[PDB]
Design a binder for these strands. Structure first.
Length: 101
RNA sequence: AGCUGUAAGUAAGCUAUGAUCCAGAGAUUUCCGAAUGGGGGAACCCAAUAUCUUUUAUAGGAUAUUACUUUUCAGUGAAUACAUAGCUGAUUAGAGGUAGACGCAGAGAACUGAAACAUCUUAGUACCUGCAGGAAGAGAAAGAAAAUUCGAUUCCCUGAGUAGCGGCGAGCGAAACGGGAAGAGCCCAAACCAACAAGCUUGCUUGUUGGGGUUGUAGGACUCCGAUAUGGUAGUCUGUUAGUAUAGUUGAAGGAUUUGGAAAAUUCCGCUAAAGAGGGUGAAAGCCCCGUAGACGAAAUGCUGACAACACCUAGGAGGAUCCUGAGUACGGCGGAACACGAGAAAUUCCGUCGGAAUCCGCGGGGACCAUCCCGCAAGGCUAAAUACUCCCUAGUGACCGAUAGUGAACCAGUACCGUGAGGGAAAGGUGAAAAGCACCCCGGAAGGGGAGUGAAAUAGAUCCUGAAACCGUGUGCCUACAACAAGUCAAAGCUCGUUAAUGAGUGAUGGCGUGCCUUUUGUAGAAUGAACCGGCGAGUUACGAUUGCAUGCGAGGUUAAGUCG
RNA sequence: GGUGUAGUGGUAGGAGAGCGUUCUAAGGGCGUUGAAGGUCGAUCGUGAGGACGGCUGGAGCGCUUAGAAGUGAGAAUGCCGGUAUGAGUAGCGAAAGACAGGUGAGAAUCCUGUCCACCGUAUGACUAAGGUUUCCUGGGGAAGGCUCGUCCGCCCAGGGUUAGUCGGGACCUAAGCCGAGGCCGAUAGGCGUAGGCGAUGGACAACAGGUUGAUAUUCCUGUACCAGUUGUUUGUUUGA
RNA sequence: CUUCUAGUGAGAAAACAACUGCCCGUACCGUAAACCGACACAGGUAGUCGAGGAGAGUAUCCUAAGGUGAGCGAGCGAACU
RNA sequence: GUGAAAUUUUAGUACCUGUGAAGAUGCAGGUUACCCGCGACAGGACGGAAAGACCCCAUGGAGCUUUACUGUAGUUUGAUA
């Protein structure tokens, strides 16, 4: 999906613009992604098997995948991603000076 | 790099030793149904014969085989002796469905038009039945014509609403010449000659296989010599490659600022294009995501070319003694039909019935019939393309619809529902960017509500976008219990307000005048006709011809049709 | 442009010139600092009609010039939908109940009792069609029930039907039906022989009692019967 | 079912014991609120059983075994039907 | 307690004598009459329900008759195979 489940990522659009975080889960075929600490939401649960005291709880919500950008692990600036011919495990070979991501 | 459909919810698991997913080839495939071992009220019931299994044994389980017809071969076989009916067995093919389409045949209406109706029209249309094919049908002159000819069939333009047909009425309605798309030709019978069998006429009569031979400028046989080579195919599940359909790969270029919950919007300053087609993203993006222009790719299976093999087919010149060239056929009388042609002066082509030729010194046609001239050679077979149609699969397109529209059906629709049955047949789309879908408290059995919270917004709370009218309520400024009112209009005191600012707005005691709307009628308030009310839908259009007015281009001239490239 | 003079009721019907709706092209524009749509106003033009302002609303839409049309609604005893009036009106589908006590948020209507009343060749018991889960147990009360409801043939969750001998098949045939060959006939097909299907009839071996919340000639107890199978108890000529 | 022969055709009669015996239906309503009548509808629905007194009787009235009080009520006690 | 229907242009819906498509709640001139209901009766609303079944028309249908026209199945008689 051009973004994987273990991955550091920066946010382009939507109220968390400029935040970073490690990807938490990938949902292909709906093209969304959960990022750590990024789209916090407040629910209201009644007691059930998990947390028999259901308070007002807060977890992340999935954002759309094109609101996101990969970060080169070694250098730290967000990059568009391209594919090139290494010994034939084709990996995302970063733009912005041809390094492996 | 995630995954176990819709589909939430939980429980158990799988995957970097490559899941899930995608394309080619395989394997498995209960029962009904042509249904085919026998039966039957479809999805059930009951067997026979062999091999194998459970049991000490019977009962029980499994696997194969077993319809009918045809067409080939053996065995058995008889009223009736020889053998043919028959019977048993082995072999060969059919059988049913559909694409509510397109084709060729058999049989074959009516309402309707003729301002009635019989001939005629509707119309050889609708319906029913047979046979197909990927196309069918037609197709290689017993032809079209009229001097000077041309050469198989089909389709389009034109000829032309002409020549004709017709209770000569309503109406029906050609063809050839001329211009184009596509183009292609072939095989038998007969005479004769051999091999075999029967009649052994031991005459050569019957036949079976092979050869020869295919036409009108007449051709062949037959006798004479030449040659014994050369031109082609509408052929094969044979090889060699080339492409192609069915998965995929890669693919340029942006940040800050203002307003917002959120920018793709605004303002600055950049970059990219063989890519500014389109879709998505919290609002409107060439530069965020999927793509696009361009470049690349197939283990397997199927298609289409090309070139190779293999299979088939194809010769001249002369002679004119004799033989061959499709018989109950052509044709004629009688009765019907088909030809645009309704018996007509009726040629041509078919069907039923009866009669019935000739043989190259011949036979047919040129719209009754004859003579002369001209063009052909029936009574045997096959054949690509140019033309018709779309159940279905891929890729797209639209001065086509947008939930009473568009399919009957945007949603679990040929469904619910209705009918014994054949058959008839609907209604019903939209929270939000994201479920963040209201934890906790209070009234109440609950339903429902009020706070508090989510959220940019809840009067976006699931009967959830917007939220019109009929219709039902609550509150108020002004009027109303001596008054006969198609309900308004003109005149007007009092009270209450204060506008798109101008000769202001609401209500109104009291006074004059005044019999709705539509349709059809000589004529309507009509006791003539229609409407409960509100909302939606609901009626002179298009194709091809003919005529007139206006307008433009050419002008004694004007203009192209089918078709070809695009 | 001025000025004079003359004219300007109208059904059938002829002629002219315009208003508004949707879509296409080209040009110039607007929009989350809020488009279309909805609602209100005391505004403009000779008419169809055009603006501007408030409130609502949340994503698209005007203007100019030309083009194309499923282009305008008050009426068809029109079609579909929604809602009125008649009106809190007719009716609530033959019949005897009363009281005490239970349950419950709530009782004329549900439960338990007592007395009273109704049918009794049926309004009692069993069965073939037909229906198809309506049967039993535990919960429920939004709709169905002509009132009510704590109740139910309603709704949710679980559960119930046991055969050598009963009724049907592995037995028989009636009417009628089907029919290998056959005979007839534009097609399709019509009839019919051998042989079959087809009960409402023929044939054919088990009874009495007990037991569940729901089955009993089916389960259990006792005592039987029918058809087979295994074991231990003479010449297929035929007198076996 | 019972006889008689024709008939491929070792030798089966009957004692005890113990074994074998398949498929379909089977709940519940059924003179009814469960079937046919659009309805929890004063209609229709084959067959067997169907008691007592008085009576010829399955008539008639009252009852036995069994079943039932019928799915809108409380008042008033006019016209009229 | 529950809860319909046929109907309906809008209605603040009197009487007499006239007028008028010639029999008026609504038009003229008069006469009478405070506002809103309940139980009853049927004179009027040419009352509701059914685009007259009576009568005539459409160069409308359909069923029937016959010495109306034109045909035909069936029966019969001749020629010919």
């Amino acid at each position: 999906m051009f973004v994987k489940k273990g991955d550091k990522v920066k946010v382009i659009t939507g109220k968390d613009k400029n935040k970073e975080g490690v990807v938490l889960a990938a949902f292909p075929k709906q093209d969304k992604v959960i990022v750590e600490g990024v789209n916090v939401v407040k629910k209201h649960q009644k007691p059930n098997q998990a947390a028999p005291q259901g308070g007002i709880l807060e977890v992340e919500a999935p954002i759309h995948v094109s609101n996101v950008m990969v970060i080169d692990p070694s250098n730290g600036e967000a990059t568009k991603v391209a594919f090139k011919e290494v010994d034939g495990k084709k990996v995302r070979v970063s733009k912005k000076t041809g390094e492996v991501l």
